[PDB]
Design a protein around this ligand. Sequence first.
Ligand SMILES: *[C@@H]1O[C@H](CO)[C@@H](O[C@@H]2O[C@H](CO)[C@@H](O[C@@H]3O[C@H](CO)[C@@H](O)[C@H](O)[C@@H]3O)[C@H](O)[C@H]2NC(C)=O)[C@H](O)[C@H]1NC(C)=O
Ligand SMILES: *[C@@H]1O[C@H](CO)[C@@H](O[C@@H]2O[C@H](CO)[C@@H](O[C@@H]3O[C@H](CO)[C@@H](O)[C@H](O)[C@@H]3O)[C@H](O)[C@H]2NC(C)=O)[C@H](O)[C@H]1NC(C)=O
Ligand SMILES: *[C@@H]1O[C@H](CO)[C@@H](O[C@@H]2O[C@H](CO)[C@@H](O[C@@H]3O[C@H](CO)[C@@H](O)[C@H](O)[C@@H]3O)[C@H](O)[C@H]2NC(C)=O)[C@H](O)[C@H]1NC(C)=O
Ligand SMILES: *[C@@H]1O[C@H](CO)[C@@H](O[C@@H]2O[C@H](CO)[C@@H](O[C@@H]3O[C@H](CO)[C@@H](O)[C@H](O)[C@@H]3O)[C@H](O)[C@H]2NC(C)=O)[C@H](O)[C@H]1NC(C)=O
Ligand SMILES: *[C@@H]1O[C@H](CO)[C@@H](O[C@@H]2O[C@H](CO)[C@@H](O[C@@H]3O[C@H](CO)[C@@H](O)[C@H](O)[C@@H]3O)[C@H](O)[C@H]2NC(C)=O)[C@H](O)[C@H]1NC(C)=O
Ligand SMILES: *[C@@H]1O[C@H](CO)[C@@H](O[C@@H]2O[C@H](CO)[C@@H](O[C@@H]3O[C@H](CO)[C@@H](O)[C@H](O)[C@@H]3O)[C@H](O)[C@H]2NC(C)=O)[C@H](O)[C@H]1NC(C)=O
Ligand code: MYR
Ligand code: MYR
Ligand code: MYR
Ligand code: NAG
Ligand code: NAG
Ligand code: NAG
Ligand code: NAG
Ligand code: NAG
Ligand code: NAG
Ligand code: NAG
Ligand code: NAG
Ligand code: NAG
Ligand code: NAG
Ligand code: NAG
Ligand code: NAG
Ligand code: NAG
Ligand code: NAG
Ligand code: NAG
Lengths: 57, 57, 57, 225, 225, 225, 187, 187, 187
Amino acid sequence: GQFISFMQEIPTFLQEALNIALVAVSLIAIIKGVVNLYKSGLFQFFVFLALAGRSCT
Amino acid sequence: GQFISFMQEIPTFLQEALNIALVAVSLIAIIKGVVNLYKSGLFQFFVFLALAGRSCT
Amino acid sequence: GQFISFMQEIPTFLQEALNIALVAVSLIAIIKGVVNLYKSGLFQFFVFLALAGRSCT
Amino acid sequence: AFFSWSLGGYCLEEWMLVAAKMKCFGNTAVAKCNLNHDSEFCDMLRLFDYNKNAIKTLNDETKKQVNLMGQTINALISDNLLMKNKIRELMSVPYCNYTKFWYVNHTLSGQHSLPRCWLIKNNSYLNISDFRNDWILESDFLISEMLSKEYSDRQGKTPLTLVDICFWSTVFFTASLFLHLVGIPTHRHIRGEACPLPHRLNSLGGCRCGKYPNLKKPTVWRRGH
Amino acid sequence: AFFSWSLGGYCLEEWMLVAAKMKCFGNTAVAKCNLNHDSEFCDMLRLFDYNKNAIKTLNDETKKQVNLMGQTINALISDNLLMKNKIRELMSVPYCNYTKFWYVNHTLSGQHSLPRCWLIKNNSYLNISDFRNDWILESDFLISEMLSKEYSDRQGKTPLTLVDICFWSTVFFTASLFLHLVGIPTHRHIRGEACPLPHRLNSLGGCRCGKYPNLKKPTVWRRGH
Amino acid sequence: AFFSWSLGGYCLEEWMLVAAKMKCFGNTAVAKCNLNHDSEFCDMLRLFDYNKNAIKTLNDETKKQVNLMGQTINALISDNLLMKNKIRELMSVPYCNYTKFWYVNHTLSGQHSLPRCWLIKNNSYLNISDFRNDWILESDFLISEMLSKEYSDRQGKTPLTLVDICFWSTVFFTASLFLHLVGIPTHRHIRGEACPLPHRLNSLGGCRCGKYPNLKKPTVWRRGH
Amino acid sequence: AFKIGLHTEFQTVSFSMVGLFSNNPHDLPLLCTLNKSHLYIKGGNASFKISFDDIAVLLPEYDVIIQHPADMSWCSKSDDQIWLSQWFMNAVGHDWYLDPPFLCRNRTKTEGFIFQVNTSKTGINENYAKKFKTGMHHLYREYPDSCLDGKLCLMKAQPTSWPLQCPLDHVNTLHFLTRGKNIQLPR
Amino acid sequence: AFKIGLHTEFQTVSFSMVGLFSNNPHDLPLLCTLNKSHLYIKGGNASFKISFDDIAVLLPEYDVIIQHPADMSWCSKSDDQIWLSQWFMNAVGHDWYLDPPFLCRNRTKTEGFIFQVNTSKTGINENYAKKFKTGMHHLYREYPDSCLDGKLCLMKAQPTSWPLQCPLDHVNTLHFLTRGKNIQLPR
Amino acid sequence: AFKIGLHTEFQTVSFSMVGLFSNNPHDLPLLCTLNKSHLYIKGGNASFKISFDDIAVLLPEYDVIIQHPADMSWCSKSDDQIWLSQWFMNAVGHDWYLDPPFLCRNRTKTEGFIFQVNTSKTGINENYAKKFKTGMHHLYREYPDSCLDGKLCLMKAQPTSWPLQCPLDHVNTLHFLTRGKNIQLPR
Ligand SMILES: *[C@@H]1O[C@H](CO)[C@@H](O[C@@H]2O[C@H](CO)[C@@H](O[C@@H]3O[C@H](CO)[C@@H](O)[C@H](O)[C@@H]3O)[C@H](O)[C@H]2NC(C)=O)[C@H](O)[C@H]1NC(C)=O
Ligand SMILES: *[C@@H]1O[C@H](CO)[C@@H](O[C@@H]2O[C@H](CO)[C@@H](O[C@@H]3O[C@H](CO)[C@@H](O)[C@H](O)[C@@H]3O)[C@H](O)[C@H]2NC(C)=O)[C@H](O)[C@H]1NC(C)=O
Ligand SMILES: *[C@@H]1O[C@H](CO)[C@@H](O[C@@H]2O[C@H](CO)[C@@H](O[C@@H]3O[C@H](CO)[C@@H](O)[C@H](O)[C@@H]3O)[C@H](O)[C@H]2NC(C)=O)[C@H](O)[C@H]1NC(C)=O
Ligand SMILES: *[C@@H]1O[C@H](CO)[C@@H](O[C@@H]2O[C@H](CO)[C@@H](O[C@@H]3O[C@H](CO)[C@@H](O)[C@H](O)[C@@H]3O)[C@H](O)[C@H]2NC(C)=O)[C@H](O)[C@H]1NC(C)=O
Ligand SMILES: *[C@@H]1O[C@H](CO)[C@@H](O[C@@H]2O[C@H](CO)[C@@H](O[C@@H]3O[C@H](CO)[C@@H](O)[C@H](O)[C@@H]3O)[C@H](O)[C@H]2NC(C)=O)[C@H](O)[C@H]1NC(C)=O
Ligand SMILES: *[C@@H]1O[C@H](CO)[C@@H](O[C@@H]2O[C@H](CO)[C@@H](O[C@@H]3O[C@H](CO)[C@@H](O)[C@H](O)[C@@H]3O)[C@H](O)[C@H]2NC(C)=O)[C@H](O)[C@H]1NC(C)=O
Ligand SMILES: *C(=O)CCCCCCCCCCCCC
Ligand SMILES: *C(=O)CCCCCCCCCCCCC
Ligand SMILES: *C(=O)CCCCCCCCCCCCC
Ligand SMILES: *[C@@H]1O[C@H](CO)[C@@H](O)[C@H](O)[C@H]1NC(C)=O
Ligand SMILES: *[C@@H]1O[C@H](CO)[C@@H](O)[C@H](O)[C@H]1NC(C)=O
Ligand SMILES: *[C@@H]1O[C@H](CO)[C@@H](O)[C@H](O)[C@H]1NC(C)=O
Ligand SMILES: *[C@@H]1O[C@H](CO)[C@@H](O)[C@H](O)[C@H]1NC(C)=O
Ligand SMILES: *[C@@H]1O[C@H](CO)[C@@H](O)[C@H](O)[C@H]1NC(C)=O
Ligand SMILES: *[C@@H]1O[C@H](CO)[C@@H](O)[C@H](O)[C@H]1NC(C)=O
Ligand SMILES: *[C@@H]1O[C@H](CO)[C@@H](O)[C@H](O)[C@H]1NC(C)=O
Ligand SMILES: *[C@@H]1O[C@H](CO)[C@@H](O)[C@H](O)[C@H]1NC(C)=O
Ligand SMILES: *[C@@H]1O[C@H](CO)[C@@H](O)[C@H](O)[C@H]1NC(C)=O
Ligand SMILES: *[C@@H]1O[C@H](CO)[C@@H](O)[C@H](O)[C@H]1NC(C)=O
Ligand SMILES: *[C@@H]1O[C@H](CO)[C@@H](O)[C@H](O)[C@H]1NC(C)=O
Ligand SMILES: *[C@@H]1O[C@H](CO)[C@@H](O)[C@H](O)[C@H]1NC(C)=O
Ligand SMILES: *[C@@H]1O[C@H](CO)[C@@H](O)[C@H](O)[C@H]1NC(C)=O
Ligand SMILES: *[C@@H]1O[C@H](CO)[C@@H](O)[C@H](O)[C@H]1NC(C)=O
Ligand SMILES: *[C@@H]1O[C@H](CO)[C@@H](O)[C@H](O)[C@H]1NC(C)=O
């Protein structure tokens, strides 16, 4: 439950430049990772498997 | 010789989820790195240099 | 000013293999990053914007 | 036995506290004076522990009619601290008389500081305007102590060798990533011609199978076809 | 009050030092004996603090004509340490008499070690050739202490959870990087034919729109067109 | 001199141990009571050190016929601890009499805990069924102490600034890796036409060299040719 | 008890002296101050009241001049009272064979128990006045001194009942037990 | 010595008392218990045996009633024995000029050395019996008490040879040296 | 003060004793050694010089044989000198009613103040010579002993003015204040 404690204590920990830097880096990395996964096409393969045999569009 | 001590004490350290997670990540990274090196072709260049002048197959 | 202190105390800290390994890794990473940025072409886009409307060469 | 605890912990009941209730202190907080000889709170705590164990022994009915000596009391209370307090009193500077203690509390996780002695002067209690400079320092030290305690708690479980191996594996993975990203030329192509593979040309522009004559034709390293 | 400092710090003036000047010690260095009962330097420091506070009380003119007792002095000096030193003297081994102290200094940041006692023997001072084995150890310990102090100073500010989240985000980013780098086949191509998209072929080689008949033609997974 | 060691170490010979042999303790283990005044083992160790140095001084033949006082012995043994033990005995609770000590041993690296006192009761020795709850705690603390000691040993050598620089260099390298992986469009292509390079078109669809007229033709950003 | 900073609170703890002083199985000495002249000491079954004023009640030409602790046995009928008297005098720091004596009444009278000490602040006795002074300064944790540089300052001690209002001080008990040795407290 | 957990072993260490007690260049006091009545003390060259029983061997109307330590000089012919006797009596915690005396034999007899203490458990002496009791309770680390509430409990001390079987206790030596002061041990 | 290693320097600190010894508001005892025979003690307003040699100046058949501290009052005219004498004798560790006495001059003479102790190194007194010896060994931090196994070693103490050259030792002051108790230092 350390995540819950951190979400409770965000205002106190936000006062440090290192803290905001690290959290910004993590958020940017997570969203870029989502972008790269999308640009991969593994999800496209899963959709293709889930679509095979339903419609030819 | 810390590596030897770790290889001796694997059974005690295996009882932690963080430990198994880290070792699994390291092993996966090492084998994927081998795969990527193979897919590079630097080894192919070394083989080409070691083959130049022997046979034209 | 920890950077200045480190640049002052380089000769004492150079005596450790881990230290030279880490600094070599960092320098190699920085120069390779410069190389990769060059090979990207974002700087090429900036040059293109700074050149648009001056000459058609 | 007595107060030599080697580590939800120590609690005190009604006949000890003036509020006539029961309060419990965390084991981490209590352990901070298992070796300290300069804390008024823990001397009084040892006195109360001796009282409780005397009660227990009377209940056990040992019946050893042993008269108490002053030496036992002198071996529980830091006489140096008492002399220091009396010296302070004679010099007209603030001191305390083992009655009231205060601490900074951390409500989120129940962590608290070790109580200090609320100093007196001229038969009065030092108040907020003079005691201000201590609560802020105590609270900052409390937060720092909590963070360091959690860091050490996770520290004492994971081998450093595993961390180092993981880091080096990561750097190797990244180097291989870039190395695959750029790619390396594999063979030679004659300038203006197509791919001569599988016939691998030499530095002279020809092949040893006879298909490509040694005409000193220009050759350029290429990766793809 | 007296020497129980809970943390540019303590300074001593002319009438304390033989050099007739003023020297200041860092708070980190001074705090190292707020609980130590085995350091000759800090016993003498407590004596000098008592002298200074007596001066201050006389200036305040409390006029309490209280005769001094030997008990107050015995409650400031570690009598155990004095007895140990006298035992050493009777046994003809080196000892010190609270006059001269030495320390290793760090000029770059002003950090210094806690002074030790320059031991004597036969009414002389132990010299460099016998005292060598201590300065090197003291200096190494000083550098190690400085590095550890800085590490703990940054340690007590940043939550470990944030570090762990950053590390896991980085490893996820790298895995996604490679995963995009290689790329995965998306659809099927009949061997020898062009791209049948958007008509998505089945495993049988045909399409359910009727454009591609079910002729059991060979199919290979491909990513690009 | 005497027992104030500032850090394969201290060893004891036949006439000290009941087993009539010689045992050596690690310096890290021994150093744990250079300031502790609450350990029966180290008081007896100081007594034995005084005996050994008396032997050495007699061998030196100082011939100082100085009669021993009880004060010297009282300045070596923690009289507070002795009074506590006697209080325990009078109260019919377990205690120890400085004869038998036990410790948890780590065979792989030779690391051991500091010996404790095997408590007695009713002229007998407390046995395994009552002493169980301590060995497990001692062993866990031993392993944690070893891990923390190694972590601090590597901690006190490497500057944190270097670690931070390495981490930031790694994150920059990864960002550049992705940034090269995707790639950015470089110039403009007229919809349906070929690559107009090196003639760099404007936003209007033409070129300022006159080759491409300003016909407001559609333009799309492209990277490759 | 006011909230301090954020997520951190301020709370104090105070201990009760009645339980400690009424729960310890062995008896303990009690020292008390009432108003500014009524000083009280209690040990075992002897409860003495001490006052300082300018009245002479014993004279060397009429009663016992106590010079040695052996001679103390002629002042009381109870061993507990004699033990408490010697206890207090040695706690104060009186040297029997080096300082001027004090006066006591002999047991063969139906009057009671009274003992008087001269602590005047003039003449030779001035010096003694210092010593004794400091003594009391190290026991009661305070000293409501009730005699100035006037001609006489005579201290009288007399046994009375224990008032049921005295503050239950304990620093005085600690100092009492700390100073003197070879003392066993009964039940 | 059983293996505990994994890779960790259990081992104990025990020290030998004979080397310490026979190696220290200065002499040290010895206190011993034998069976349940033979208590032994030894210091310098004086070896005393102490027993508790119901036999009267000295009477106040026949021998010396020791009241002051100066009067102690008439009981022995050796300074070491006198020093040890005073040492033990002050370690036990006897107040010479405040408690009932004890009896000793005068040197001008060819009998020997004997001294007797009354520690009966009745009458007035009951109280004294407490004090002395606690004394011995703080030295021998144990107390095989050998006299109940019976009419008399007389303690006798007499010098005998040192038996070569006594356990070499040392907690008693520590307490002996701790309690009394201004004591120099010879060689 | 030589540079050690790199970036680290060697520096020492030494404290001045004159300020401490001349600044403390209360008076403190002083002990000094001059040449190898002139031992000096000073307390309050009494400044005594101690020497050891082979001259007899007092005889038991001519002056006072001090046996008890009460009898000490016949040797001086000043309370400070008597207090310092008793202070020193109890610091050395002399048992008044157990060891051979020492000799002093009675006040009713216009000569002065002198007191003599026998610490010869032969006969019975040999043993006493040990005790006293150790005493001085624990106060002066040194001992320039000035009497060998010769027939007599008599110590004489006489009050003189304080020389203005004595080293301002303080370990001796610490040991002096540590050993004895119930001592109040005046201003
Ligand atoms: C020294 O410790 C004593 C206890 O030994 C403390 O005494 C306490 O003094 C305070 C002063 O305000 C008392 O508070 C008030 O007292 C009365 C009676 O209860 C009443 O006005 C209020 O209800 C309130 O409680 C407190 O009761 C009293 N406690 C005891 C047990 O005597 C004292 O605080 C310490 N010394 C000084 C100078 O503060
Ligand atoms: C014990 O502490 C005393 C102080 O109580 C120290 O005394 C010091 O001894 C040194 C010895 O060299 C003296 O240094 C020299 O002394 C004279 C007079 O000043 C002169 O030749 C030089 O100018 C130089 O200072 C020093 O002055 C002296 N200080 C005092 C205050 O007496 C002593 O060092 C310690 N004991 C031993 C055995 O070293
Ligand atoms: C207090 O410390 C003493 C030493 O001063 C310890 O005495 C030891 O007691 C044990 C009890 O079992 C003895 O073990 C056995 O004793 C005899 C004689 O050796 C024999 O049956 C066995 O060979 C075995 O050793 C041990 O010898 C004895 N040691 C000494 C030096 O007396 C004692 O353990 C401690 N007190 C208690 C109550 O345990
Ligand atoms: C308790 O101690 C006080 C201390 O002052 C005694 O009072 C003092 O008694 C002496 C007796 O000799 C008085 O001395 C005489 O005073 C006058 C001159 O002042 C004159 O009559 C004589 O020449 C002689 O010096 C002294 O004055 C007096 N102090 C005061 C301030 O009056 C008191 O007697 C003692 N009480 C008992 C019962 O011992
Ligand atoms: C050693 O101490 C004991 C303590 O009991 C002495 O025994 C007690 O001696 C007294 C002498 O007065 C006895 O008192 C008398 O007892 C009866 C009535 O009980 C009667 O004869 C008298 O009225 C008087 O009260 C007392 O009873 C006796 N205790 C016992 C339990 O019999 C003993 O004499 C002391 N020994 C020496 C040598 O001093
Ligand atoms: C100070 O103490 C010394 C300690 O030696 C005293 O000197 C000793 O005095 C005694 C007196 O009885 C001498 O004993 C006699 O000696 C000879 C044989 O040696 C003979 O005359 C007698 O048979 C008797 O034993 C003893 O010899 C002498 N010591 C020396 C070394 O000569 C000294 O008298 C004491 N001074 C004072 C003032 O008490
Ligand atoms: C109490 O035990 C709560 C523990 C919280 C663990 C934090 C998990 C963080 C997961 C981040 C994954 C990165 C994004 C895919
Ligand atoms: C004792 O000194 C042994 C030290 C062991 C060092 C560990 C080396 C780990 C190497 C991992 C490299 C990553 C894979 C290429
Ligand atoms: C004193 O405060 C100096 C602090 C120095 C900070 C170090 C900054 C290092 C920057 C490295 C960036 C990586 C290369 C783009
Ligand atoms: C701190 O405050 C909390 C608030 O809920 C309380 O429950 C807790 O007991 C306090 N901690 C103490 C008194 O140690
Ligand atoms: C103490 O308080 C009282 C009132 O209770 C006041 O008269 C006096 O001046 C104060 N003294 C000091 C020293 O503060
Ligand atoms: C302390 O000072 C504050 C200032 O706000 C005041 O409110 C408070 O009453 C004072 N305390 C006492 C006990 O006078
Ligand atoms: C260490 O040396 C420096 C050199 O500049 C000096 O300024 C500093 O005061 C010294 N530190 C001390 C004495 O603590
Ligand atoms: C001490 O030094 C002196 C000279 O000052 C010398 O004669 C003597 O031998 C030395 N003694 C020792 C024990 O070193
Ligand atoms: C200590 O030894 C060194 C060796 O170089 C010497 O120079 C120095 O003078 C010696 N010190 C003394 C005080 O003799
Ligand atoms: C721990 O056990 C090992 C086993 O080989 C032994 O060699 C070592 O001495 C022991 N450690 C001690 C006694 O400190
Ligand atoms: C002690 O052990 C004995 C047997 O040696 C037994 O009779 C007795 O009851 C025991 N006493 C206690 C208090 O355990
Ligand atoms: C302690 O208890 C265990 C239980 O297994 C038993 O084997 C052992 O003998 C007991 N020890 C003694 C000394 O009785
Ligand atoms: C002492 O004060 C109490 C409490 O107010 C009172 O009852 C008593 O009469 C006072 N004593 C005197 C002598 O005034
Ligand atoms: C009065 O006291 C003296 C001194 O102790 C004493 O000797 C005397 O007997 C007492 N008076 C009577 C009448 O007993
Ligand atoms: C005391 O016990 C020992 C050892 O068994 C024995 O020799 C001796 O006779 C016993 N003493 C008595 C009086 O029974
Ligand atoms: C018997 O002892 C007394 C008391 O000390 C003593 O005076 C007397 O001289 C001794 N008897 C003989 C015959 O000497
Ligand atoms: C003691 O030494 C001092 C200093 O040199 C000198 O003045 C004095 O005369 C010496 N005393 C004797 C008796 O020689
Ligand atoms: C000499 O001293 C004695 C012993 O104290 C004393 O009684 C006597 O009075 C003194 N001499 C004179 C003449 O006073």
